[PDB]
Short mmCIF file of C-alpha atoms in Angstrom, two decimals:
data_model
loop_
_atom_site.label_atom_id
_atom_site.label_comp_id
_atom_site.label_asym_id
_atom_site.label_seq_id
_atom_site.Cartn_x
_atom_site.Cartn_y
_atom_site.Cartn_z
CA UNK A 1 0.00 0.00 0.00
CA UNK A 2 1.38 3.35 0.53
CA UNK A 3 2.20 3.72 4.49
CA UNK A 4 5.48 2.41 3.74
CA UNK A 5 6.30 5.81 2.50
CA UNK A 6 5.73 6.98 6.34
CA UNK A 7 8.95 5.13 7.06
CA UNK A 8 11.60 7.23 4.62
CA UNK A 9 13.30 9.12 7.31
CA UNK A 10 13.74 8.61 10.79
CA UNK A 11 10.75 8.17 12.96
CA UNK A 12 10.40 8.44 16.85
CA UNK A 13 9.34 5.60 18.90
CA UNK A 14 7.60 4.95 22.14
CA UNK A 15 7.77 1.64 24.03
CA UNK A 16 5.07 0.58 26.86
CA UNK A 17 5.24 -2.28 28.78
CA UNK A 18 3.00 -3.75 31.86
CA UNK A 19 3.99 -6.93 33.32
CA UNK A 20 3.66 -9.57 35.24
CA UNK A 21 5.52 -12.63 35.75
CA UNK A 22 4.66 -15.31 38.36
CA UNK A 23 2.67 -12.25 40.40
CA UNK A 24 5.91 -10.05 39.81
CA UNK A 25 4.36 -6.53 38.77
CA UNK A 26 6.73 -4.26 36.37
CA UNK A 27 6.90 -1.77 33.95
CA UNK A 28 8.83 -0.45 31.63
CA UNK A 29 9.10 2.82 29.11
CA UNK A 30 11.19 2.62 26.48
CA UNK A 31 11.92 5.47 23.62
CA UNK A 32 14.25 6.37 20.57
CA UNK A 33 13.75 6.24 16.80
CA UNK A 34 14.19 3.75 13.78
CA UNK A 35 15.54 3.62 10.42
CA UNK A 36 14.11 1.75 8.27
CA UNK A 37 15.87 2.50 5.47
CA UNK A 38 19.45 0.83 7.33
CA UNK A 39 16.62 -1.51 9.02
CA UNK A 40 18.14 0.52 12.45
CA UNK A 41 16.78 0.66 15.97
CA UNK A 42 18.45 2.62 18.42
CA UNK A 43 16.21 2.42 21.99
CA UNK A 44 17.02 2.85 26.32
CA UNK A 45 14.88 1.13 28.05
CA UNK A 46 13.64 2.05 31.51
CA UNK A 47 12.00 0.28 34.25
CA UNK A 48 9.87 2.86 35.58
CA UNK A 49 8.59 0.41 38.48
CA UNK A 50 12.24 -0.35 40.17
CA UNK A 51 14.07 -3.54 39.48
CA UNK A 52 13.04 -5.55 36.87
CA UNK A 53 12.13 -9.20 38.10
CA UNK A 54 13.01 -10.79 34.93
CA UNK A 55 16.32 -10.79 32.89
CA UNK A 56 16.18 -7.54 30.43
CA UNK A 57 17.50 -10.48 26.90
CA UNK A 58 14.32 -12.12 27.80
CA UNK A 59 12.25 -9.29 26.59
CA UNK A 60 14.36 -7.86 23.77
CA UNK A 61 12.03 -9.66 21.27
CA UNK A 62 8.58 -7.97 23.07
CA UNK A 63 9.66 -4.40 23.72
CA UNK A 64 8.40 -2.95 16.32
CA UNK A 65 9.10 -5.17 13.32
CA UNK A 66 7.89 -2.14 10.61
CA UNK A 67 11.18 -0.83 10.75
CA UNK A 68 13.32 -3.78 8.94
CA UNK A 69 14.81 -3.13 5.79
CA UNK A 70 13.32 -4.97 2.98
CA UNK A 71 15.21 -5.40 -0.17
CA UNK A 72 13.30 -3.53 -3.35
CA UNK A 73 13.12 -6.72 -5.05
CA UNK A 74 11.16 -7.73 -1.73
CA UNK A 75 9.06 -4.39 -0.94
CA UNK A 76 6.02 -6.42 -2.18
CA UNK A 77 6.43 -8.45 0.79
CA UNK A 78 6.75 -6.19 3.42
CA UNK A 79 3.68 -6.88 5.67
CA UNK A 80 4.61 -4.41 8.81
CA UNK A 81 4.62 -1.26 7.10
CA UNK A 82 1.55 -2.31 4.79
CA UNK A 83 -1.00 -1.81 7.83
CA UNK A 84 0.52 1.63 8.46
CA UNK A 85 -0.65 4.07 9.88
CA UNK A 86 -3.21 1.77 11.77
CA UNK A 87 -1.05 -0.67 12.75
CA UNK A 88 -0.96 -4.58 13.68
CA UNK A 89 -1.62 -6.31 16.73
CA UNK A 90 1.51 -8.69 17.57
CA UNK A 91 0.71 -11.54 20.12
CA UNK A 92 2.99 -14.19 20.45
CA UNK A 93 4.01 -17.11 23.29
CA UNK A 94 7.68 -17.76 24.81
CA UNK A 95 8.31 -20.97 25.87
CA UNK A 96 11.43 -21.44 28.14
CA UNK A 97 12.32 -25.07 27.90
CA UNK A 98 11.78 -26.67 31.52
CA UNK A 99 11.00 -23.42 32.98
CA UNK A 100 7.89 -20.78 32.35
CA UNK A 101 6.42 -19.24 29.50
CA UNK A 102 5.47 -15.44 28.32
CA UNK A 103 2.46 -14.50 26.84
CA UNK A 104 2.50 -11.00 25.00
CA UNK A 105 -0.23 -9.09 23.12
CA UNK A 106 1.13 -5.76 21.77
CA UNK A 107 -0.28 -2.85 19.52
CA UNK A 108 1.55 -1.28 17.33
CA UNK A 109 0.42 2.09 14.98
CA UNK A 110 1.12 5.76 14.65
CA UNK A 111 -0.06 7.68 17.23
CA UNK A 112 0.60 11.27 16.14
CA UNK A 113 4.11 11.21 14.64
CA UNK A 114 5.84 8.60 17.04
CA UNK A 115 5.34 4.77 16.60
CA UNK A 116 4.08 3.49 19.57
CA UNK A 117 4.83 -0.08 20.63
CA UNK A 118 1.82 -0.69 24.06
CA UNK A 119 2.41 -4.12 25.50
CA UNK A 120 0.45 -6.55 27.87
CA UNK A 121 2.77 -9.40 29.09
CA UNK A 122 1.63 -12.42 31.77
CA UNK A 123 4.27 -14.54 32.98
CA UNK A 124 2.88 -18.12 34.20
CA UNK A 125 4.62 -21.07 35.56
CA UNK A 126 8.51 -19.96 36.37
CA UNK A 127 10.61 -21.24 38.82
CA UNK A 128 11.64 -18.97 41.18
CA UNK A 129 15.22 -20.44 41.63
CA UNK A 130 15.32 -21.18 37.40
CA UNK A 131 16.81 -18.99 35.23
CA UNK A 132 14.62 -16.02 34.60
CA UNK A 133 13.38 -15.51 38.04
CA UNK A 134 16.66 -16.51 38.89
CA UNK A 135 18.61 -13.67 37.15
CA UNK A 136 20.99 -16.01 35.55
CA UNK A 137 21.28 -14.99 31.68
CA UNK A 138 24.19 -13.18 30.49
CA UNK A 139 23.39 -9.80 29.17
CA UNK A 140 23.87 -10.74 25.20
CA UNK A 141 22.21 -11.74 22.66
CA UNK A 142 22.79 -13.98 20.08
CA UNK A 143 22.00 -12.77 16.11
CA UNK A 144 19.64 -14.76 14.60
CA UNK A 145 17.06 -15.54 11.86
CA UNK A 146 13.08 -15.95 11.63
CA UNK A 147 11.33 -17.46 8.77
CA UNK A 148 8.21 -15.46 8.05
CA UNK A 149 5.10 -17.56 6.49
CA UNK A 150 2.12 -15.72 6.03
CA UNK A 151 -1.76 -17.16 6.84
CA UNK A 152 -4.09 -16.42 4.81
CA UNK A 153 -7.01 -17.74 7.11
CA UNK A 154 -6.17 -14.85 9.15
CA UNK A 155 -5.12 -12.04 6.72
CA UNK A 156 -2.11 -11.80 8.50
CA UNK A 157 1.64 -13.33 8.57
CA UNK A 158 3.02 -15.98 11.40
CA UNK A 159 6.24 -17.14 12.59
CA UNK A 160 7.89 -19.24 14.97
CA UNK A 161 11.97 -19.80 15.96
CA UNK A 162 13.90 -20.59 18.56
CA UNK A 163 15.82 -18.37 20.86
CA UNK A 164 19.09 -19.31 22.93
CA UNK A 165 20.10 -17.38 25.86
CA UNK A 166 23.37 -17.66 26.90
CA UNK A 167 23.47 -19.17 30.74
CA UNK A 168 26.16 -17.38 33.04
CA UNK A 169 27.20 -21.43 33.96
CA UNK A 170 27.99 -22.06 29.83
CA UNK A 171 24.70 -23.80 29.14
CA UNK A 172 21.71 -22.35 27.15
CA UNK A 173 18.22 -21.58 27.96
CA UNK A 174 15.96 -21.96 24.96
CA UNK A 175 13.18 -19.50 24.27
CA UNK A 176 10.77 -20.94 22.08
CA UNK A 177 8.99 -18.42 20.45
CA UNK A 178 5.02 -18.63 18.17
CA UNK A 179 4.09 -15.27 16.85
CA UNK A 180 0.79 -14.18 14.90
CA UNK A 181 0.50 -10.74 13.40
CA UNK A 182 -2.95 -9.60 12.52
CA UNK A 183 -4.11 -5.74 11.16
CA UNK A 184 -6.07 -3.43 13.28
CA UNK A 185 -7.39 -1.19 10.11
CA UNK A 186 -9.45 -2.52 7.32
CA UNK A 187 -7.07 -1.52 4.42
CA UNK A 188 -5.25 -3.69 1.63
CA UNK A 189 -2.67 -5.80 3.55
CA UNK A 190 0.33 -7.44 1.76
CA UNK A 191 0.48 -11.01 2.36
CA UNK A 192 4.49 -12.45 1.48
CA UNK A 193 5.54 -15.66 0.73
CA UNK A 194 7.92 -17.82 2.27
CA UNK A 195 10.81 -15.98 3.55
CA UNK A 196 13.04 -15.01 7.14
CA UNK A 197 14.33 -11.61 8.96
CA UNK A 198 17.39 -11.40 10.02
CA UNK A 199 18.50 -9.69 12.99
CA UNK A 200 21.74 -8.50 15.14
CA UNK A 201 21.40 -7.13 18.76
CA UNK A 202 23.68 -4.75 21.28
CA UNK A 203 22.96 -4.48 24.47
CA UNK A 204 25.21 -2.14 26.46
CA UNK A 205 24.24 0.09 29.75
CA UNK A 206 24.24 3.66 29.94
CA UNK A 207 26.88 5.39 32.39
CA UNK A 208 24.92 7.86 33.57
CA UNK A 209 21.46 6.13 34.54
CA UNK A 210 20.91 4.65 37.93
CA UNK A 211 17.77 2.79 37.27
CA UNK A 212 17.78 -0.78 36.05
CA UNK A 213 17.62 0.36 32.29
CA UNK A 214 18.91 -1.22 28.66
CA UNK A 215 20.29 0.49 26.07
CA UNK A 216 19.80 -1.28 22.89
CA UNK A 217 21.04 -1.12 19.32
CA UNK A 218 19.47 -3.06 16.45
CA UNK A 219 19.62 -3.65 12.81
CA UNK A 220 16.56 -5.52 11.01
CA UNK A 221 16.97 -7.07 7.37
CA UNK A 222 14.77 -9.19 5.44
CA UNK A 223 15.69 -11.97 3.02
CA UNK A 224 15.11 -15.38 1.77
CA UNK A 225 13.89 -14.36 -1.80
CA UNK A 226 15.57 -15.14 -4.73
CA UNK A 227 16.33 -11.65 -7.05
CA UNK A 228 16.89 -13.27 -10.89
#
């Protein structure tokens, strides 16, 4: 459609996050801006209720997929920016092998000139000694790549991967992640075909900031088409 051409320059985004993980209240306010164009994401992430009860890689997935860079031999596949300016709904489930599972349901759309990113996470079923409640995940996070399939029964894409997190002891801690995207407008929606994003993520702190916070760099890029 044509709200792809709302994503030429830099935009500003907003981040909004209420949790709750085995009763464990947080939240946590996040802003920046994205480049689509580079498929960039520059955020800090704050958590605006204190110390965050969960490990800050575990979330780097829920806390704005319209900002990828799709190829122009690919722009015909680009679902995210398609149901622009109203937005998508993103829900998904993460399930930590032998340990608890997220359950997200996020809106994303324009609201004004900033991309807002509102999200509802429940955390069920963790063990309070495991990893995540436990606090033991390195603060990393490893690069890599999620094939995209698109349903038609829903007029909207899915995809599911695998995460690792890196495990201060030398193991790893999958994440298994299913995602469904759906469209909040009524407008025409491109459905792709067959193909994966790949993805690259920095997590460093910020010197200056005394509240449990992430800084967060990180480039978007779509692929898995064949050009000719």
């Amino acid at each position: 459609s044509k709200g792809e051409e709302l994503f030429t320059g830099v935009v500003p985004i907003l981040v909004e996050l209420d949790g709750d993980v085995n009763g464990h209240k947080f939240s946590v306010r996040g802003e920046g801006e994205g480049d689509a164009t580079n498929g960039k994401l520059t955020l800090k992430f704050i958590c605006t209720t204190g110390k965050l009860p969960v490990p800050w890689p575990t979330l780097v997935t829920t806390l704005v997929l319209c900002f990828a860079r799709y190829p122009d031999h690919m722009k015909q596949h680009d679902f995210f920016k398609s149901a622009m300016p109203e937005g998508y709904v993103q829900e998904r489930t993460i399930s930590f092998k032998d340990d608890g599972y997220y359950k997200t349901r996020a809106e994303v759309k324009f609201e004004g000139d900033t991309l807002v990113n509102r999200i509802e996470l429940k955390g069920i079923d963790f063990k309070e000694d495991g990893n995540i409640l436990g606090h033991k995940l390195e603060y990393n996070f490893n690069s890599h790549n999620a094939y995209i399939t698109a349903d038609k029964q829903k007029n909207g894409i899915k995809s599911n991967w695998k995460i690792r997190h890196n495990v201060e002891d030398g193991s790893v801690q999958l994440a298994d992640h299913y995602q469904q995207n759906t469209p909040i407008g009524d407008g025409p929606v491109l459905l792709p075909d067959n193909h994966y994003l790949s993805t690259q993520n920095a997590l460093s702190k910020d010197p200056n900031e005394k509240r449990d916070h992430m800084v967060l760099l990180e480039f978007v890029t779509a692929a898995g088409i064949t050009l000719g």
